[PDB]
């Protein structure tokens, strides 16, 4: 089951307790979760620092058993062109969250590989449906993201 997995995947943190090294960002996001308001987050740092683990554990302490109906995770393995942003993300954001755990979450892992047109179109999806959804952006290289996208996202730096 979980005994035939590589140690890099077998020891993936499941709660924010098990994420070590990054203390300030973890404390801040825990307080954000408890206070009930979560801004549009942007996680930046070297590879293998615990960004995906942190956001996934946060979205498991924010939703629970509905972590599969409230979180939409898109990454580089999926097409994220202009049509994808205009249709899939827009329809996920416009729809209602069945009231479950307040706002819905959208995790954009490896956003540095996204085209500039998609990032530019995502600007008016981030700030229009912010009342229903919160976007999280994970990236290793900040130079590939438009400055407008960086403006509307709260930057948390994952140190080595």
């Amino acid at each position: 089951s979980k005994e035939n997995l590589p140690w890099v995947e077998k020891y993936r943190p499941e709660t924010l307790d098990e994420v070590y090294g990054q203390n300030e960002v973890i404390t801040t996001v825990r307080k954000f979760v408890d206070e009930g308001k979560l801004p549009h987050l942007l996680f930046y740092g070297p590879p293998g620092t615990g960004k995906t683990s942190t956001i996934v554990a946060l979205a498991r302490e924010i939703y629970g058993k509905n972590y599969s109906n409230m979180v939409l995770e898109l990454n580089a393995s999926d097409d994220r062109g202009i049509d994808v942003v205009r249709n899939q993300i827009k329809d996920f954001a416009s729809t209602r969250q069945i009231f479950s755990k307040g706002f819905k979450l959208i995790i954009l892992d490896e956003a540095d590989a996204m085209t500039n047109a998609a990032q530019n179109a995502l600007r008016r999806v981030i700030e229009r449906y912010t009342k229903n959804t919160r976007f999280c952006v994970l990236a290793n290289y900040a130079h590939k993201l438009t400055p407008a996208l960086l403006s509307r996202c709260t930057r948390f730096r994952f140190q080595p």
Partner: protein
């Protein structure tokens, strides 16, 4: 309504156009209203807001009710149906047809259809046709959303790229290029507007300080419409709101001249270069610009500068050519060229004239050489069971093989140097 719509000219004398250009347009138009007029089309090209269509409207409000309205198009084959019914406007329907509305030319298919339909118009066998006029506004097309097409009409929206050479060269097509409105006309008209609004400008207390802005605007833009819009915005304002007018794009040779000689507006090299990259990165990011720099850096002092400077310039260009298409490469090359030409520049230099690179001619000649070599190869393969690599054709056979195949003929095969002789 808006000053550029309320103070529109009612006669030609209120039109902001040069006298000579006006004469050329008038004589051409009148000649196009003749039963059998050599010229069938009148392609007016130029920057935006140069009275390209204002003058045409005024002129067709005089010429039309003399040999007989402007019937403007409204932009796949819809333009075909429009032009299929734009030919019946014959005598008693003579109505100068103006095509300021360009059927979408950013789409390959309808661009080709536009070109091939205007060609059919040019080669029409009908004995009587209406005066056809097309207005094209030359405006650099900004950098798209990663568009990898990077085709011709994805850099500049110009007549050359919308039409094909044949169209623009057809004997029956007359082209009259238009120039930005000169500061003389701009001041002359921006003052007429002020003597029509001196009332509000007086109570506003700006009627006194009106010639300052009338001159700054006349020196900042050649666009009459933008000038009037800026004047309206400044006049209706209250405070010291900054006077900002639209921004125009430099030309290819204009950019080359700015890189080589510089600009009088700015004596700062860094600021000028940075602004050129910011506003013009759709040309400074094309290899033809570096080829133009290489071809025209000898037009400084007519080519009477030290050889060390030329060596440094060309060495830097070669070094930046192996930096890939990186942004730093051009910023280094242009900066080095400008530095080199700044240190050597003085007073007393009768600079030369710049020219476009001849690389396209070399590529066409290379294609011709390839076409020549292929025939030789297949002839040999069918007549001598001989396979020869193109490298050996370009280094040995191209010269020896025709000499032998011609001299043996001297006593189907090639008798001339493959691809023409070396000069």
């Amino acid at each position: 309504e808006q000053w550029y719509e309320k103070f529109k000219p009612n006669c030609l004398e209120q039109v902001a156009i040069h006298k000579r250009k006006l004469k050329d347009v008038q004589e051409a138009l009148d000649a196009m209203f003749l039963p059998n007029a050599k010229h069938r089309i009148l392609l007016l090209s130029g920057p935006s807001g140069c009275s390209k269509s204002t003058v045409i409207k005024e002129l067709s409000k005089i010429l039309v009710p003399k040999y007989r309205k402007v019937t403007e198009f409204r932009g796949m084959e819809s333009f075909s149906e429009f032009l299929k019914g734009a030919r019946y406007l014959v005598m008693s329907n003579l109505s100068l047809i103006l095509i300021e509305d360009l059927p979408n030319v950013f789409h390959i298919d309808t661009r080709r259809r536009f070109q091939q339909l205007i060609l059919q118009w040019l080669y029409s066998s009908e004995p009587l046709l209406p005066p056809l006029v097309i207005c094209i506004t030359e405006c650099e097309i900004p950098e798209n959303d990663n568009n990898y097409r990077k085709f011709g009409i994805d850099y500049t929206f110009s007549a050359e790229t919308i039409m094909n050479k044949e169209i623009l060269m057809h004997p029956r097509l007359k082209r009259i290029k238009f120039n930005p409105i000169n500061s003389t006309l701009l001041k002359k008209h921006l003052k007429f507007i002020c003597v029509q609004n001196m009332k509000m400008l007086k109570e506003k207390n700006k009627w006194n300080k009106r010639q300052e802005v009338i001159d700054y605007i006349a020196q900042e833009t050649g666009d009459i419409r933008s000038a009037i819009t800026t004047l309206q915005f400044w006049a209706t304002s209250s405070g010291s709101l900054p006077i900002s007018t639209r921004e125009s794009t430099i030309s290819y040779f204009h950019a080359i001249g700015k890189v080589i000689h510089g600009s009088h507006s700015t004596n700062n090299d860094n600021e000028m270069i940075n602004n050129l990259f910011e506003n013009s990165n759709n040309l400074l990011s094309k290899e033809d610009f570096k080829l133009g720099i290489l071809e025209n850096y000898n037009t400084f002092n007519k080519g009477e500068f030290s050889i060390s400077d030329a060596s440094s310039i060309v060495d830097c260009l070669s070094e930046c050519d192996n930096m890939n298409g990186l942004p730093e490469s051009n910023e280094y090359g242009l900066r080095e060229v400008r530095k080199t030409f700044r240190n050597i520049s003085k007073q007393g230099h009768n600079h030369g004239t710049v020219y476009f690179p001849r690389e396209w001619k070399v590529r066409k000649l290379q294609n011709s050489f390839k076409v020549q070599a292929e025939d030789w190869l297949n002839v040999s393969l069918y007549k001598y069971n001989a396979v020869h690599s193109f490298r050996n054709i370009t280094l040995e056979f191209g010269y020896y093989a025709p000499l032998i195949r011609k001299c043996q003929s001297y006593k189907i095969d090639v008798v001339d140097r493959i691809g023409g002789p070396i000069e």
